[PDB]
């Protein structure tokens, strides 16, 4: 894994001592070469995981998320011009190097053997995102958004460290195998309940669930496209990854104590899918969509079925791709018209004839189109939760109906019916935006052909 | 007779033979409780470096 750590370091002074109007080509080319080399990882077989040290090791949960990170880097590094192409050379290099450093800590975090190391690189992922969204937020409440982001994610995430130190000095080391192969049941006392609530509540903050979800939408509508897509896809699916790893301990008490979180997640999934049906501010619909789908992920993690974990990791990867792409189309329409609203930018079937295909195809991958990976994830979560109880499938299908409703309303609102005929500034679609759309969609369809990769540990 | 002692001959620390024996433990106290076991010998390089969270060797 060091063969993936060290060229991420070496790609950073590349950006500094490449000359003017040549940093772009070198960084894009070399990060795509890193993406091929990342795809060469996929070796993981059968019985064990694979160990790239006593420091690095990869479960089959971590492999598609790692390839997702090293694939979402060059897509973003191309995605983030035309709103900073007029800015300075030094600030431009600082932004690109900040994204490279954020990739580095994400690789650190996904191949974290030890949970202490996982926590350190977790909040190391947390650090540069505040700087990115605050320095290039392009709105007036970016301070409020970054500050809520910071204090929510710390003040939830912080006693997790105390619980991990306690496990460190009551059971020896914190390799995942020796945390495994040794883990003993922890009975229904109260201190065990608070340890569970500390760990699970830190990751509850990170996902988010419904009582803690206003964390998210300000940090997406008041942020640039790079921070938005990395924030949503890699940070929320990293939180889910972390909960998947740490839930191997605390086996008996989750049945006793894990009912109200299931409850808040289900009813807030319904209320969040309802709130993203009537809003303006086009960017925010995808944010509350992400809240709904990760509440579904949380229900899937806290019930403890192998069907549930396969559906959980499939839903994670598919929704990461879909929500990142749909953020990128929203930024494309915002670069067309400086609005951020929804009822203004109408028309766009007549004009921009090719963009309709990407809007429709992204809205259908959000619709749970049936050969796609999104429906595979949602379907296995529905199967596992109907095994959990015979009555909760009503909420799942009602989420399904409202999800199709708001997604297809988001389609037929902005891009259906009549241009407002006072706009007269929109240019035909560049090759860059459609290259980004083709870099989003085509891996999702090619995984829809062969999804034996993205199903996780319990394949 | 009785020659006067010169200045300063009422000095000059003096021997005398006795009959009673010289005493052990004139401070009527108990024995000494415990010595401390002294750590000696050569030392090996440490077992796996630090044995902290990580930073192995
Ligand atoms: C996720 C993180 C980002 C990843 C970015 C790169 C993703 C690349 C995905 C490519 C998937 C290709 C799957 C594929 O074509 O399978 C062969 C698929 C399905 O085949 P298969 O994979 O089920 O098995 C074929 C096995 N042999 C070749 C031995 C017979 O083949 C076809 O569709 C036939 C045409
Ligand atoms: C939320 C705070 C989480 C603090 C870390 C979790 C924890 O152990 O809490 C139990 C701690 C106290 O429990 P404790 O960690 O001292 O557990 C003692 C366990 N026995 C009895 C077996 C020796 O309570 C709090 O932190 C209260 C808040």
From Swiss-Prot, chain A:
Molecular function terms, GO-annotated: NADH dehydrogenase (ubiquinone) activity; ubiquinone binding
- EC numbers listed for it are 7.1.1.2
Q: How does it sit in the membrane?
A: Multi-pass membrane protein
Which UniProt keywords are given for this protein, alphabetically ordered? Answer: Electron transport, Membrane, Mitochondrion, Mitochondrion inner membrane, NAD, Respiratory chain, Translocase, Transmembrane, Transmembrane helix, Transport, Ubiquinone
Note whether Membrane occurs among the keywords.
Answer: yes
Chief place where the protein resides: mitochondrion
Task: Summarize the protein's role.
Answer: Core subunit of the mitochondrial membrane respiratory chain NADH dehydrogenase (Complex I) which catalyzes electron transfer from NADH through the respiratory chain, using ubiquinone as an electron acceptor. Essential for the catalytic activity and assembly of complex I.
* Identification of the protein by name: NADH-ubiquinone oxidoreductase chain 4
Point out the gene that encodes the protein: MT-ND4
């Amino acid at each position: 894994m060091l063969k993936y750590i060290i060229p991420t370091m070496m790609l950073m002074p590349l950006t500094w001592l490449s000359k003017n109007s040549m940093i772009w080509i070198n960084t894009t080319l070399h990060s795509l070469l890193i993406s091929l080399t990342s795809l060469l990882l996929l070796n993981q077989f059968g019985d064990n995981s694979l160990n790239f040290s006593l420091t690095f090791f990869s479960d089959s949960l971590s492999t598609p998320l790692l390839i997702l990170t090293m694939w979402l880097l060059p897509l973003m590094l191309m995605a983030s011009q035309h709103h900073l192409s007029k800015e300075n050379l030094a600030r431009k290099k600082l932004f690109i190097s900040m994204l490279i450093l954020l990739q580095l800590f994400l690789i650190m975090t996904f191949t974290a053997t030890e949970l202490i190391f996982f926590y350190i690189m977790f909040e190391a992922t947390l650090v540069p995102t505040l700087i990115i969204i605050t320095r290039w937020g392009n709105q007036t409440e970016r301070l409020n958004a970054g500050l809520y982001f910071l204090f929510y994610t710390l003040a939830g995430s912080l006693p997790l460290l105390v619980a991990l130190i306690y496990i460190q000095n009551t059971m020896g080391s914190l390799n995942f195998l020796i945390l495994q192969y040794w883990v003993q049941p922890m009975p229904n006392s109260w201190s065990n309940t608070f340890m569970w609530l500390a760990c699970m509540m830190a990751f509850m903050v990170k996902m988010p669930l419904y009582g803690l979800h206003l964390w998210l939408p300000k940090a997406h509508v008041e942020a640039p496209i790079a921070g938005s897509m990395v924030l949503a896809a890699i940070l929320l699916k990293l939180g889910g990854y972390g909960m998947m790893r740490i839930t191997l301990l605390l086996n008996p008490i989750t049945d006793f104590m894990a009912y109200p979180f299931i409850m808040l997640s289900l009813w807030g999934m319904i209320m969040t899918s309802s709130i993203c049906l009537r809003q303006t501010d086009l960017k925010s619909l995808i944010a509350y969509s992400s809240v709904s789908h990760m509440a579904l992920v949380i229900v899937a993690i806290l019930i403890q079925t192998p069907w549930s974990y396969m559906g959980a990791t499939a839903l994670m990867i598919a929704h990461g791709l879909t929500s990142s792409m749909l953020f990128c189309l929203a930024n494309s329409n915002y670069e067309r018209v400086h609005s951020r609203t929804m009822i203004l930018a109408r028309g766009l079937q007549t004009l921009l004839p090719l963009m309709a295909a990407w809007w429709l195809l992204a809205s259908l991958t959000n619709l749970a189109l049936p050969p796609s990976i999104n429906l595979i994830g949602e379907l296995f979560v529905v199967m596992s939760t109907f095994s959990w109880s015979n009555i909760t499938i009503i909420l799942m299908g009602l989420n399904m109906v409202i999800t199709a409703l708001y997604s297809l309303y988001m389609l037929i609102t902005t891009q259906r019916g009549k241009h407002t005929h006072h706009i007269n500034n929109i240019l035909p679609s560049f090759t860059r935006e459609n290259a980004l759309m083709s870099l989003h969609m085509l891996p999702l369809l090619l995984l829809s052909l062969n999804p034996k990769i993205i199903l996780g540990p319990l394949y | 007779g009785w020659v006067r002692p010169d200045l300063g001959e009422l000095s000059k620390v003096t021997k005398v033979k006795t009959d009673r024996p010289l005493p052990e433990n004139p401070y009527h106290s108990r024995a000494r409780p415990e010595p401390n076991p002294e750590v000696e010998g050569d030392l090996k390089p440490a077992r796996h470096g630090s044995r902290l969270f990580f930073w192995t060797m």
